[PDB]
Amino acid sequence: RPTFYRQELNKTIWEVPERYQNLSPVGSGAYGSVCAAFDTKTGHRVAVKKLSRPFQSIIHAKRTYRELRLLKHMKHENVIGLLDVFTPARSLEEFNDVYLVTHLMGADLNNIVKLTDDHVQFLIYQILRGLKYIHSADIIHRDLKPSNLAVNEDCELKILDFGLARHTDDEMTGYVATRWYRAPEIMLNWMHYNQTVDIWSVGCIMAELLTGRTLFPGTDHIDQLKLILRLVGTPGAELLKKISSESARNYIQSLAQMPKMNFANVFIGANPLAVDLLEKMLVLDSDKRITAAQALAHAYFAQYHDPDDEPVADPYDQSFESRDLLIDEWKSLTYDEVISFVPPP
Ligand SMILES: OCc1ccc(-n2cnc3ccccc32)cc1
Ligand SMILES: [Cl-]
Ligand SMILES: [Cl-]
Ligand SMILES: [Cl-]
Ligand SMILES: [Cl-]
Ligand SMILES: [Cl-]
Question: What subcellular locations does the record give?
Answer without folding.
Answer: Cytoplasm; Nucleus
